Design a protein around this ligand. Structure first.
Ligand SMILES: *[C@@H]1O[C@H](CO)[C@@H](O[C@@H]2O[C@H](CO)[C@@H](O[C@@H]3O[C@H](CO)[C@@H](O)[C@H](O[C@@H]4O[C@H](CO)[C@@H](O)[C@H](O[C@H]5O[C@H](CO)[C@@H](O)[C@H](O)[C@@H]5O)[C@@H]4O)[C@@H]3O)[C@H](O)[C@H]2NC(C)=O)[C@H](O)[C@H]1NC(C)=O
Ligand SMILES: *[C@@H]1O[C@H](CO)[C@@H](O[C@@H]2O[C@H](CO)[C@@H](O[C@@H]3O[C@H](CO)[C@@H](O)[C@H](O)[C@@H]3O)[C@H](O)[C@H]2NC(C)=O)[C@H](O)[C@H]1NC(C)=O
Ligand SMILES: *[C@@H]1O[C@H](CO)[C@@H](O[C@@H]2O[C@H](CO)[C@@H](O)[C@H](O)[C@H]2NC(C)=O)[C@H](O)[C@H]1NC(C)=O
Ligand SMILES: *[C@@H]1O[C@H](CO)[C@@H](O[C@@H]2O[C@H](CO)[C@@H](O)[C@H](O)[C@H]2NC(C)=O)[C@H](O)[C@H]1NC(C)=O
Ligand SMILES: *[C@@H]1O[C@H](CO)[C@@H](O[C@@H]2O[C@H](CO)[C@@H](O)[C@H](O)[C@H]2NC(C)=O)[C@H](O)[C@H]1NC(C)=O
Ligand SMILES: *[C@@H]1O[C@H](CO)[C@@H](O[C@@H]2O[C@H](CO)[C@@H](O)[C@H](O)[C@H]2NC(C)=O)[C@H](O)[C@H]1NC(C)=O
Ligand SMILES: *[C@@H]1O[C@H](CO)[C@@H](O[C@@H]2O[C@H](CO)[C@@H](O)[C@H](O)[C@H]2NC(C)=O)[C@H](O)[C@H]1NC(C)=O
Ligand code: NAG
Ligand code: NAG
Ligand code: NAG
Ligand code: NAG
Ligand code: NAG
Lengths: 65, 747, 63
């Protein structure tokens, strides 16, 4: 629909015999977005995940599984 | 408008269609490109810049023609000087965007109304920057269509005359700005405003006046706002509000009647209060005709019974992660339609038996991580609808019998990490008493999780009454021994039982005439008692029932004895499985392997002249191996010597026997290793006796003359029986006996 | 010593691939987010190789 934008907790830059599309953390260890309601303990931080090669960028809370 | 065809075309910037979109890169060969457009036709277009001075916009792709698009997103871009941004959008051939998103930290200037010329038709605008930047209040001029606004520039205060032409604005997002006060006289200019997100600001002393005219507003978020306390009428003008959010604040207390004027509430959330809030004031959520979802987490210590009084619509409640010691009994009296209570992580030690009295529709209950100590009989006697239940990591010790009789709606039951034993005396166990766990009535149950408890028996009900059971977890209990009846699960439903890390020291499996059972990590002793189990582990034994269960045993290891210790179950061979016989003669270690019913007696001390008194052979046993190797015997006892009389094997090598009578030999004999003795001659009666009998004869001082002639004919034909024929020697010079004729010795 | 908003299941089949569990389903702590946002776990790809599974706070233009 119109204005159907989705907001991720961690901003990142999707870039490219054969090339490879990767995703990389915009910043290293920048605080996560919309992370105001998580406990004082969780300390949400953005992390860089791979596949070695970058794959995406996720927000990482400190707690139990 | 713009497709794969335009993409292939040179040499300006290079395009390459990926996934379903197109990743244009200008310049075509740059490492860190000036621009990186990403076009997904008809949908959106993201423009990712990397600019030094504003003059870099030349390297933009020429004559692109992207056509209609709903969403435009600019990241890391220079504000375009005294040029409308809509110019750049025209240059790229974009037509009628619904959303513009401007998100940079390299602006070059401050945002101006002129940037937004020709983008008056917008429905959604977002401007985000972590630069220190001022936002003009004449910025959103003639923005009659803006329905969603969001600005984030560390905004310290916003003057009312910003929202002058925002007549159609329905939702506002100003989180993570520095707003210290609510702008006065604003809701009059926006009569369709529904969402008001003001989280992560500084909106401390809000007051009843701050919301005058906001009867259009449905949702107001003020979480993460240091709010120490609110006036009891802050929301008094918010008459049709439905979603409040007072989270991440600093409440020590709240005034009563706080929501009194807002009887249209649908969900309040007071999660994660950055300081300890002891309790909620009386009737705080009482008399709320539409209130449903609730979320409370402020390290609450107690609650009033009238907290939800007359609020018969609540469906979810999250009272998890508090400090509740108990609950008042009436607390959920009227909450008929409740669906999911969640009291996880408290100091709950008891829940008044009438707590879930009326909560007739309750489905998911969670109580894990508390100090509960046992399930009573009335506590769940109404939850026929309760589908899945959790009490993991408590200190439950006493599940009543009548506890789970009405919970026929239950499917998943997790009582892991407690001190539940079901109080079973071990003697009713050994005597196969048909008795049920309190879970007996739950036939349709799917999940049982008694991990980390103290169960000492696989109860009757879990095999025969629970046929639907798919998941059974008895790992980390205190079951010491299994029988083939402990593996008889009547479940035609992919049952996977976990019996890891218990105290199973033996597995009594017999030779006889779909469920998975993990048995890894167990104190199994590897004596003759677990014989048939090991055969079953390998392809060897498969006694009917075997195929109806599938044992996982890959990490089952023998604890004792020290010989087999450290070694898996598929590796060992059943002849090692011996059970020491204590009776046994002095100086002689003994044992019994049930692999062949063989009573073995090892008297390898090296100091016996007589055959020591031998324990009788059971009327079940079949082999008796008198091992008297490397001693100094003299004569053998009679065939009628008890114990000795039942011997099948006689390993007397390395001894001093000088003559063997046919009566000194056992009736049941089958082997006779008299190698390395003092024998010079064997009578012809002995040779008839040795008619199957494996025999050893070498290493003896054989006097080969005419009286040895029978023996010389024995060997010559009884080749199989004598393993050391070629080693048999004569003492009349010495030559091998197999080098002799019956005439070298006989004139 | 970490938990992510979207439970996934990384693999190793022929390249290492992370993959959503409950895609199109609400994220974990789906209540710990600001009000207009709807937490729903997204399956992200690369190159079709499932490379990542993250939570997309999606804002509809409706209440
Ligand atoms: C208030 O409280 C009520 C009751 O407690 C809640 O209602 C419950 O919501 C649950 C929503 O998750 C729902 O549980 C579901 O049941 C469905 C079966 O009918 C399942 O399909 C569903 O999704 C699962 O999600 C898993 C990941 O968490 C995953 O294993 C799997 O996801 C796969 O399947 C989907 C298709 O559904 C695919 O799209 C995807 O790609 C995956 O392959 C699985 O589907 C979940 O199990 C309960 O039924 C609801 N209770 C009822 C109806 O009584 C409310 O949600 C609560 N409200 C609030 C606001 O908290
Ligand atoms: C029943 O529950 C037990 C809990 O102890 C489960 O045990 C664990 O199973 C996993 C299976 O992968 C084992 O992990 C693996 O271990 C091997 C050997 O070290 C390693 O090479 C693998 O990479 C992997 O880490 C684990 O060791 C094992 N034990 C424990 C203590 O975790 C068991 O799997 C469950 N079985 C069923 C059928 O549910
Ligand atoms: C945006 O406009 C503001 C005006 O409010 C500019 O603020 C200036 O900030 C500097 C500090 O770096 C002060 O020394 C100036 O005195 C401020 N200006 C005034 C008029 O007081 C700000 O620099 C502008 N940002 C830009 C152009 O990027
Ligand atoms: C917003 O709340 C107001 C509260 O007064 C609702 O006003 C209704 O109409 C008049 C006021 O003009 C009152 O006399 C009625 O009693 C109100 N109706 C009710 C409370 O049901 C107004 O309807 C609400 N707006 C919406 C969209 O629900
Ligand atoms: C489950 O919830 C339903 C509502 O969906 C309950 O139904 C109502 O219960 C109230 C309780 O006082 C009665 O006043 C209504 O007359 C009932 N209406 C209907 C249509 O049933 C139901 O009682 C609850 N309990 C069970 C076991 O379903
Ligand atoms: C089995 O459960 C017990 C508790 O039921 C765990 O023991 C510890 O318990 C104390 C509190 O009584 C706490 O330190 C932790 O809850 C536990 N210690 C830990 C986790 O290190 C025990 O750890 C559990 N063991 C298994 C294998 O599940
Ligand atoms: C048992 O027979 C062995 C022969 O293997 C005897 O051992 C030898 O006996 C002679 C005669 O006394 C000695 O000269 C040797 O020194 C012995 N050799 C040894 C002991 O290695 C042994 O004496 C016999 N024992 C009995 C009780 O008859
Ligand atoms: C932009 O170009 C500069 C050039 O030095 C480089 O350092 C930077 O990493 C580039 N940024 C991006 C997002 O490519
Ligand atoms: C608002 O949208 C209308 C279409 O409904 C259109 O005429 C124009 O783009 C906008 N008018 C304004 C902003 O005055
Ligand atoms: C507003 O709240 C702050 C929080 O500390 C307090 O210091 C201040 O006195 C309050 N202002 C008024 C007018 O109550
Ligand atoms: C565990 O098994 C032992 C066997 O010696 C038994 O005496 C005991 O009652 C069981 N439970 C606990 C908690 O020790
Ligand atoms: C040798 O046999 C005798 C027979 O009783 C026994 O007493 C003795 O212990 C044995 N030798 C050794 C070294 O034990």
């Amino acid at each position: 629909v119109g204005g159907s934008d989705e907001r991720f907790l961690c901003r990142s830059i999707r870039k490219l015999k054969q090339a490879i599309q990767i995703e990389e953390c915009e910043g290293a260890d920048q605080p996560c977005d919309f992370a105001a309601n998580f406990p004082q303990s969780y300390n949400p931080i953005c992390k860089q995940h791979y596949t070695k090669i970058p794959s995406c960028c996720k927000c990482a809370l400190k707690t139990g599984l | 408008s713009f497709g794969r065809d335009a993409c292939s075309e040179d040499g300006l910037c290079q395009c390459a269609p990926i996934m379903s979109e197109y990743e244009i890169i200008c310049p075509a060969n740059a490492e860190n490109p000036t621009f990186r457009l990403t076009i997904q036709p008809k949908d959106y277009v993201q423009i990712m810049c990397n600019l030094t001075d504003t003059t870099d916009y030349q390297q933009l792709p020429k004559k692109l023609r992207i056509g209609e698009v709903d969403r435009v997103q600019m990241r890391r871009c220079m504000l375009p000087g005294h040029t409308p941004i809509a110019s750049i959008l025209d240059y790229l051939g974009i037509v009628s965007p619904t959303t513009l998103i401007f998100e940079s930290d390299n602006l070059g200037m401050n945002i101006t109304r002129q940037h937004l010329d020709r983008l008056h038709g917008l429905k959604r605008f977002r401007f985000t920057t972590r630069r220190l930047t001022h936002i003009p209040a004449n910025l959103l001029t003639d923005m009659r269509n803006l329905s969603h606004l969001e600005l984030r520039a560390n905004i310290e205060e916003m003057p009312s005359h910003l929202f002058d032409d925002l007549e159609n604005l329905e939702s506002i997002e100003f989180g993570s700005n520095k707003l210290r006060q609510m702008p006065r006289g604003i809701f009059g200019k926006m009569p369709k405003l529904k969402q008001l997100n003001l989280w992560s600001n500084q909106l401390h002393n809000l007051t009843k006046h701050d919301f005058e005219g906001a009867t259009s507003v449905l949702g107001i978020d003020i979480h993460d706002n240091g709010i120490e306390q609110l006036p009891h009428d802050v929301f008094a003008h918010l008459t049709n509000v439905t979603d409040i959010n007072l989270s991440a604040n600093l409440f020590r207390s709240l005034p009563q009647g706080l929501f009194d004027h807002n009887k249209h509430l649908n969900e309040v959330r007071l999660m994660n209060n950055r300081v300890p809030l002891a309790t909620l004031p009386s009737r705080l959520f009482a008399n709320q005709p539409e209130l449903q979802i609730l979320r409370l987490r402020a390290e609450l210590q107690s609650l009033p019974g009238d907290l939800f009084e007359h609020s018969t619509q609540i469906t979810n409640i999250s009272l998890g992660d508090n400090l509740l010691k108990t609950l008042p009994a009436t607390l959920l009296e009227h909450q008929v339609n409740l669906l999911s209570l969640d009291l996880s992580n408290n100091r709950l030690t008891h829940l008044p038996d009438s707590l879930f009295a009326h909560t007739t529709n309750l489905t998911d209950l969670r109580l894990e991580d508390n100090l509960l100590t046992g399930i009573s009989g009335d506590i769940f006697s109404n939850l026929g609808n309760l589908v899945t239940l959790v009490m993991s990591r408590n200190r439950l010790r006493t599940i009543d019998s009548r506890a789970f009789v009405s919970t026929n709606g239950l499917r998943h039951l997790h009582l892991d990490h407690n001190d539940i034993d079901l109080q079973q005396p071990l003697l009713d166990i050994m005597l196969q008493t048909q008795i049920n766990s309190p879970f007996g009535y739950m036939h349709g149950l799917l999940t049982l999780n008694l991990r980390n408890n103290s169960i000492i028996f696989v109860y009757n009900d879990w095999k025969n009454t629970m046929l639907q059971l798919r998941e059974l977890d008895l790992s980390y209990n205190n079951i010491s021994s299994l029988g083939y009846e402990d593996l008889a699960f009547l479940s035609q439903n992919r049952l996977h039982v976990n019996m890891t890390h218990n105290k199973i020291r033996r597995i009594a499996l017999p030779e006889d005439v779909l469920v998975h059972v993990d048995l890894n990590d167990n104190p199994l002793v590897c004596d003759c008692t677990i014989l048939w189990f090991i055969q079953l582990v390998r392809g060897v034994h498969k006694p009917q029932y075997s195929r109806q269960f599938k044992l996982r045993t890959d990490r089952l290891v023998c604890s004792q004895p020290n010989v087999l210790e450290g070694t898996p179950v598929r590796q060992i061979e059943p002849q090692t499985l011996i059970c020491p016989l204590d009776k046994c003669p002095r100086g002689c270690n003994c044992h019994v392997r049930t692999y062949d019913k063989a009573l073995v007696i090892n008297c390898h001390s090296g100091n016996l002249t007589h055959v020591p008194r031998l324990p009788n052979l059971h009327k079940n046993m079949q082999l008796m191996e008198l091992h008297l190797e490397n001693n100094t015997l003299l004569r053998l006892p009679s065939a009628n010597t008890p114990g000795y009389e039942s011997v099948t094997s006689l390993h007397l090598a390395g001894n001093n026997l000088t003559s063997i009578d046919v009566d000194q030999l056992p009736t049941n004999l089958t082997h006779l290793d008299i190698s390395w003795n003092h024998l010079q001659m064997l009578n012809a009666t002995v040779l008839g006796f040795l008619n199957w009998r494996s025999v050893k004869l070498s290493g003896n001082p054989w006097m080969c003359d005419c009286t040895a002639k029978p023996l010389l004919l024995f060997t010559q034909d009884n080749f199989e029986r004598i393993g050391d024929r070629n080693e048999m020697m004569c003492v009349n010079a010495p030559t091998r006996m197999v080098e002799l004729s019956t005439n070298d010795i006989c004139p």
